[PDB]
Design a protein around this nucleic acid. Structure first.
Ligand SMILES: [Mg+2]
Length: 758
RNA sequence: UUACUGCACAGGUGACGA
DNA sequence: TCGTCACCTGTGCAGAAAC
């Protein structure tokens, strides 16, 4: 019947008296806030400074004396609530403001973990993991037409390595190449200093430096990354350290699992409710009941989307709840039409790995048999092909060769392909030690570049993957097979839709930001992916080949107008037909870009048809969480006492926050990984207010379906493929732009129907 | 770079206004 | 150029595999 939030109602006065000055230049605002500090709350909005007296006595303020009604203008008290919450918790110091963020006063999980695991070390007490709370005042709509303010509670963990760098040297930990940060960030100061080159004498020598190439051991500390935590702890404890991490993980589950998180939110609400929260001397807020999403009374704030159907034929009759179950029993969506039933695949690999690579190829092509039910049949039988021919391309290269590996791979490929005729795809095997070399010598990106230039898509793989134990390998080969088939132009599966309008186009844009190191300013690139409504199905369209960030709005509009022109041509729209266009991204578009896109699409389709357009943001990092108290969870595995996904809403749960915004649950108890996996965060789906198509519940369910459309994996993706695929394209193309001899010429010729970016 | 998931850290950045 | 509300992206480690 209902979903519980992590937020509480805040009962506010109906009205507050304020003084208003015209203040066309916001530059004056800082001086005025300083001058009135203590007696007035000050807030600039729409060219006017608003003044709310908090404490009696001067200084004075001129301007009109207006009443601000909370139901009408909740932004004023929402903002004041940010400062008031801090003030109301004076013993809990702010580590951040707006939203107010602070640490647990006594809890420290490393100490508790160590005691539980039975471990000890004299330096453990300088490694700290402390619960961190934020209280976010947010405007929401308990029903359409009415706004309220709630306070939303979120929990994370502060990871911090307090230890002296001198102390870490002497304990035997190699600090070279570790990132280091300032101990005391002064007001506008950046944190990152650089990487440890050497420790001189009360001085750190730095490379990849952000400012000075050296600094005192006293002004620096290791950044609180998992990399630095694991590097230190494994040397100080290893291999007992893993037991500590499991122990630490158990501690954190005491704050982050459903029932524990729900209890922490409860205890926070109780604490905040105990006293009135002072907005001004005679003006009070009271924190109230937990905010819920329900269909009680005149509220209609929760619904459950139907299960997505994975579709394996053009009729719709062949469908499944899960991708792998469906693929196994039906074969792929395009089996009747798939042109190349005997693909030739180039296999490029270090000559010393020959035996391990043959074992992997055999498992891949011919299957693992019935002892490994995740991958019994093999690629050929799975996908309904006649055979696969491997063209073996050994490379004389060692893992220790960090400067010449890329040149050897590419020479071997060129020499093999010159006397071997046409290949339809490649598998490229890489050493782990080469995987993340700089792009000027990285074999992944150089082989990707050469083969894509030649029109040959590749599926690359690292040796640790090639060596996975059979129980794990079977799942790797599922995912590997799906992407390889799509790289060969295949369509593994589609997802259902019922035709409600005559045509529908969804376009997504995704961002990548590339640099050679953290020091170097990241350059932005974009990708564009298109998806079309089919009869019973969503179909993947063509993808961008140009990736420049400059002018991305023009690229969106060109992609849409050209595609609309071609869909109209193919489908021969009748007068009065409705066409719907949807845009997906992780950030909102500018109003002026929405206007331009609407104008151009409308002109292209013309006055014979009715057009509906929606612009949608999908957000992962926001302060909302959904709790389903009726969800008991599922056994963590067959058949333990532990549970996973306790209080996790079902996949496809959609909650109404406001007119323009829905919360979408994607990670159900089934999909949730382990007993200690936190209560998931839902996706926030936001409609651009200038959209002509207004149905955000439909748009949220559509985003859900598009998570299931990913051909990178059998499991669904974290975000709809319209965005996800675009980010992969942006990253690959932006990287390739810097690689000598790269050409995009074949991306719209031999690779036009290849899903080469998976 | 089989991937899904989670977390952490760092960098900042976007949109709306006047 | 600024106020205001908001959260994006990259990197690295570790546990699982929607029946
Ligand atoms: Mg891939």
């Amino acid at each position: 019947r209902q979903l519980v939030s992590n937020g509480f109602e805040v009962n506010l006065p109906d009205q507050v008296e304020v003084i208003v000055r015209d203040l066309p230049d916001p530059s004056k605002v800082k001086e005025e806030r300083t001058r009135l500090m203590g007696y007035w709350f000050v807030h600039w909005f729409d060219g006017k400074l608003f003044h709310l007296r908090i404490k009696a006595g001067g200084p004075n303020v001129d301007g009109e004396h207006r009443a601000i009604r909370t139901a009408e203008h909740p932004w004023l008290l929402r903002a004041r609530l940010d400062d008031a919450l801090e003030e109301a918790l004076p013993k809990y110091a702010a580590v951040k403001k707006r939203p107010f963020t602070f640490l647990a006063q006594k809890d420290e999980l490393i100490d508790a973990a160590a005691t539980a695991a039975g471990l000890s070390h004299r330096l453990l007490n300088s490694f700290k993991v402390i619960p961190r709370f934020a209280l976010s005042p947010k405007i929401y709509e308990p029903v359409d037409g009415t706004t309220r303010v709630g306070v939303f509670v979120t929990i994370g963990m502060r990871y911090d390595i307090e230890a002296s760098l001198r102390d870490l040297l002497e304990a035997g930990i190699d600090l070279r190449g570790m990132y280091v940060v300032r101990r005391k960030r002064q007001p506008g100061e950046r944190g990152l200093l650089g990487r440890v080159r050497a420790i001189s004498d009360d001085m750190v020598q730095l490379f990849e430096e952000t400012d000075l190439a050296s600094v005192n051991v006293n002004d620096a500390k290791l950044e609180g990354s998992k990399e630095n935590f694991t590097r230190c702890l494994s040397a100080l404890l290893g291999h007992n350290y893993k037991k500590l991490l499991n122990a630490l993980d158990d501690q954190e589950a005491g704050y982050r699992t459903g029932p524990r998180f729900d209890d922490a939110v409860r205890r926070m609400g109780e604490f905040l409710a105990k006293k009135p929260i002072r907005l001004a001397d005679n003006i009070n807020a009271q924190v109230g009941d937990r905010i819920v999403f329900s269909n009680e009374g005149q509220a209609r704030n929760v619904r459950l989307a139907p299960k997505v159907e994975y579709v394996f034929d053009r009729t719709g009759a062949k469908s499944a709840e899960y991708a792998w179950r469906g693929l196994s029993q039906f074969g792929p969506f395009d089996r009747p039409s798939f042109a190349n039933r005997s693909p030739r695949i180039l296999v490029v690999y270090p000559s010393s790995t020959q035996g391990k690579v043959e074992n992997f190829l055999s498992a891949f092509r011919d299957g693992m048999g019935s002892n490994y039910s995740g991958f019994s049949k093999g690629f050929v039988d799975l996908m309904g092909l006649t055979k696969v021919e491997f063209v073996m391309c050994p490379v004389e290269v060692s893992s220790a060769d960090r400067n010449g590996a890329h040149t050897k791979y590419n020479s071997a490929i060129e020499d093999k392909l010159a006397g071997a005729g046409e290949v339809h795809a490649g598998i490229v095997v890489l050493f782990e030690d080469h995987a993340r070399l700089p792009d000027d010598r990285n074999p992944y990106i150089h082989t990707k570049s050469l083969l894509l230039t030649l029109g040959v898509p590749t599926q690359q793989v690292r040796m640790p993957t090639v060596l996975l134990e059979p129980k794990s390998l079977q799942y790797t080969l599922q995912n590997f097979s799906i992407a390889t088939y799509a790289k060969l132009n295949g369509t593994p599966w589609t997802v259902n839709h019922d035709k409600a309008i005559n045509d529908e186009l969804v376009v997504g844009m995704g961002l990548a930001e590339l640099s050679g190191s953290r020091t170097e300013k990241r350059q932005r690139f974009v990708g564009i992916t298109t998806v079309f409504a089919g009869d019973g199905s969503y179909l993947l369209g063509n993808v961008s080949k140009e990736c420049e960030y400059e002018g991305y709005s023009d690229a969106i509009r060109e992609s849409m107008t050209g595609i609309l022109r071609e869909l109209k041509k193919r489908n021969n729209w009748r007068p009065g037909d409705t066409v719907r266009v949807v845009f997906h991204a992780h950030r909102p578009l500018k109003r002026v870009d929405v206007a331009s896109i609407v104008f151009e699409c409308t002109r292209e389709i013309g006055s014979d048809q009715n057009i509906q357009m929606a612009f949608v943001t999908v957000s992962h990092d926001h302060p909302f969480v959904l709790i389903d108290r009726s969800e008991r969870g599922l056994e963590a595995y067959k058949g333990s006492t532990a549970r996973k996904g306790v209080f996790a809403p079902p996949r496809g749960a959609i909650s109404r926050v406001g007119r323009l915004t829905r919360l979408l649950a994607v990670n159900s108890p089934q999909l949730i990984k382990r007993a200690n996996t936190p209560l998931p965060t839902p996706l926030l789906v936001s409609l651009h207010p200038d959209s002509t198509f207004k149905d955000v519940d439909y748009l949220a369910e559509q985003a859900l379906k598009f998570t299931s459309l990913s051909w990178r994996s059998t499991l669904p993706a974290a975000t709809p493929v319209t965005i996800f695929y675009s980010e992969r394209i942006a990253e690959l193309l932006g990287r390739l732009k810097s690689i000598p001899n790269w050409s995009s010429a074949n991306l719209n010729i031999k690779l036009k129907w290849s899903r080469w970016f998976l």
